[PDB]
Amino acid sequence: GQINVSFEFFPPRTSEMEQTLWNSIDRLSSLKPKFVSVTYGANSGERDRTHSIIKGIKDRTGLEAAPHLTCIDATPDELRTIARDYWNNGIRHIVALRGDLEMYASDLVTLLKEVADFDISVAAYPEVHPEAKSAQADLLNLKRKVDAGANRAITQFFFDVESYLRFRDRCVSAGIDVEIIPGILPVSNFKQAKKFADMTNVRIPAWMAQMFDGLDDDAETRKLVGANIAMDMVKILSREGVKDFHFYTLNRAEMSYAICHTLGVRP
Amino acid sequence: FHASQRDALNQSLAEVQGQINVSFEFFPPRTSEMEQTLWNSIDRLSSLKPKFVSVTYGANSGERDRTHSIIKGIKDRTGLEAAPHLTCIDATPDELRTIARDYWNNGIRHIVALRGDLPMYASDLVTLLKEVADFDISVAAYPEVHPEAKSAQADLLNLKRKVDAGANRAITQFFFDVESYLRFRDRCVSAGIDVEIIPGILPVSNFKQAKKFADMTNVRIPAWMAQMFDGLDDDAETRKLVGANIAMDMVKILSREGVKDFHFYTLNRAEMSYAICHTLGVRP
Ligand SMILES: Cc1cc2nc3c(=O)[nH]c(=O)nc-3n(C[C@H](O)[C@H](O)[C@H](O)COP(=O)(O)OP(=O)(O)OC[C@H]3O[C@@H](n4cnc5c(N)ncnc54)[C@H](O)[C@@H]3O)c2cc1C
Numbered sequence: 001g002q003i004n005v006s007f008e009f010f011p012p013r014t015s016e017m018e019q020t021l022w023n024s025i026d027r028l029s030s031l032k033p034k035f036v037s038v039t040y041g042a043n044s045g046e047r048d049r050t051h052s053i054i055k056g057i058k059d060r061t062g063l064e065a066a067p068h069l070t071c072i073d074a075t076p077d078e079l080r081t082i083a084r085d086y087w088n089n090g091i092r093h094i095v096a097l098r099g100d101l102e103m104y105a106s107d108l109v110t111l112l113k114e115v116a117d118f119d120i121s122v123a124a125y126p127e128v129h130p131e132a133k134s135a136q137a138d139l140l141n142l143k144r145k146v147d148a149g150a151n152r153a154i155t156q157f158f159f160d161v162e163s164y165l166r167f168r169d170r171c172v173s174a175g176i177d178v179e180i181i182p183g184i185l186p187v188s189n190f191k192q193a194k195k196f197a198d199m200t201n202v203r204i205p206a207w208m209a210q211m212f213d214g215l216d217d218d219a220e221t222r223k224l225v226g227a228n229i230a231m232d233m234v235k236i237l238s239r240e241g242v243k244d245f246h247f248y249t250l251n252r253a254e255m256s257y258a259i260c261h262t263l264g265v266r267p
Numbered sequence: 268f269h270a271s272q273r274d275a276l277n278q279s280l281a282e283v284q285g286q287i288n289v290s291f292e293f294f295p296p297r298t299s300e301m302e303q304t305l306w307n308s309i310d311r312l313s314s315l316k317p318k319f320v321s322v323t324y325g326a327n328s329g330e331r332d333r334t335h336s337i338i339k340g341i342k343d344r345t346g347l348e349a350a351p352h353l354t355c356i357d358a359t360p361d362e363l364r365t366i367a368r369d370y371w372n373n374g375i376r377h378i379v380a381l382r383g384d385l386p387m388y389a390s391d392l393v394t395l396l397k398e399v400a401d402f403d404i405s406v407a408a409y410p411e412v413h414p415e416a417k418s419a420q421a422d423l424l425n426l427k428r429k430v431d432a433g434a435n436r437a438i439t440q441f442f443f444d445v446e447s448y449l450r451f452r453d454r455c456v457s458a459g460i461d462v463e464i465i466p467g468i469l470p471v472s473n474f475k476q477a478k479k480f481a482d483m484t485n486v487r488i489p490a491w492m493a494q495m496f497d498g499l500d501d502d503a504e505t506r507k508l509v510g511a512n513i514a515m516d517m518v519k520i521l522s523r524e525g526v527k528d529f530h531f532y533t534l535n536r537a538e539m540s541y542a543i544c545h546t547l548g549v550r551p
Pocket residue numbers: 038039040041042068069070095096097098099100101104105106122123124129130131132133137138141145154155156157183
């Protein structure tokens with residue numbers, strides 16, 4: 001396999017979503033992802049739920065599972081205790097984040113590397129983090145995280161492919177040598193995606209807004225239309241040298257599974 | 268540079284909204300189950316206000332009763348121009364004229380003139396229909412050349428012959444190699460055929476069945492397509508997404524080339540064709 005993939009899941013908050021997640025884990029695990037990750041939500045499950053899912057994935061599939069760890073409302077001593085626990089129990093890859101609120105993500109990267117030789121992934125923003133002083137400052141921050149020890153950068157989702165491409169070029173110009181892995185968000189629920197995008201400054205091309213117009217009560221068409229968009233995107237990215245994709249599955253597997261299939265990533 | 272072109276294609280497609288005509292082809296159901304499925308599809312697709320819809324007729328089946336009834340049932344249920352397919356198999360000239368005149372006197376003014384897969388040619392059928400009355404006549408076109416045809420050129424002159432006889436528009440056999448259809452369209456105008464070569468689109472959800480249809484109609488399945496469906500025999504969900512993707516990409520390219528008319532072989536299913544139409548701006 002020339003292309004590597006990873007899948008992102010979130011801690012289920014209901015019995016129904018819990019069932020869906022494990023079904024998705026089994027489906028996607030067959031594609032042998034390089035790793036999978038589980039997000040964290042301070043008021044939507046906490047660290048224990050994130051850790052529980054991580055442990056469950058590891059026990060059930062043997063896959064490398066990376067918890068997303070944030071450093072807000074958490075003290076350095078707490079983070080070191082947590083990191084040590086994770087390492088001693090087989091968790092060797094962490095997605096180091098600041099989280100939405102003193103410490104910035106680069107501070108956490110440093111703290112983690114002091115504890116152990118963790119594989120570390122950090123967030124990158126092709127369209128600039130909402131709170132950044134400027135695009136230049138945000139790029140310098142990414143370089144700071146990479147220089148602190150980050151092994152790879154995973155981007156916020158995007159729908160304007162050129163935005164990702166230009167960003168990758170600026171990263172290279174800035175001397176950031178790790179892979180800038182595009183985070184792909186397959187869209188089946190446009191209203192939810194639009195809310196996500198508006199809150200993260202991610203641009204939704206006019207042709208895309210037009211493409212989902214009128215489908216609020218048509219889930220089947222939304223899925224076909226969304227899969228087409230995602231398949232076209234990864235095709236172009238692949239043609240531009242991208243060999244790694246991180247999928248925001250939202251705990252569902254059909255779309256990401258099919259997209260991987262078109263990339264030659266099969267069981 | 269690859270990214271820019273994509274955004275351009277997608278935007279031009281978004282701007283086509285409200286300028287593309289579409290037609291849907293259906294076949295007579297053989298079970299109570301397919302009967303319900305058909306009418307559910309008709310109700311759903313009718314909301315897209317197609318230029319017209321058509322119903323196939325099994326050549327040498329004698330079930331011409333089912334086809335005609337469905338046609339009337341569609342016209343009386345939706346009010347859409349329902350065009351029945353007519354063949355030259357198991358029918359005499361005097362017999363055909365009877366059907367033609369029977370249709371015209373029942374509201375049916377559009378007919379798809381076909382010879383029919385053998386168990387008197389289409390051109391002879393159009394000429395015959397023309398004299399009986401002034402129906403709109405749609406004939407079959409083959410981008411990859413009809414199996415029986417002795418040559419590509421001979422097959423082409425035949426279509427012209429059918430057009431010259433009074434055929435309004437030609438509808439192509441489904442195809443998956445866009446470049447083949449484009450080369451054929453160029454040959455059609457270069458050969459003096461003045462009607463549009465309407466692409467017949469076959470959205471694929473069942474590759475096995477499609478591969479079969481292709482081996483019976485002499486339609487080529489590109490290597491990239493076989494590769495795209497490889498390993499999905501027991502994955503209907505993935506096949507549908509992959510098939511919808513291929514179909515959406517095809518019409519997007521065709522639309523940019525100037526095609527404003529599409530004919531969908533629905534196989535009595537609405538989901539895929541409905542979605543493909545959506546991307547073309549054809550919506551309720
Ligand atoms: C792949 C990915 C996964 C994510 N997973 C989660 C998750 O599970 N849970 C969750 O809560 N959030 C998650 N997030 C969201 C993330 O936590 C927010 O975007 C958060 O606001 C910033 O986190 P960060 O790690 O990018 O922080 P940082 O890299 O620290 O950046 C945050 C802001 O601070 C700025 N900055 C950095 N250093 C300085 C400085 N010295 N002075 C001033 N400004 C500075 C940056 O330019 C930027 O504007 C994820 C994001 C991505 C792209």
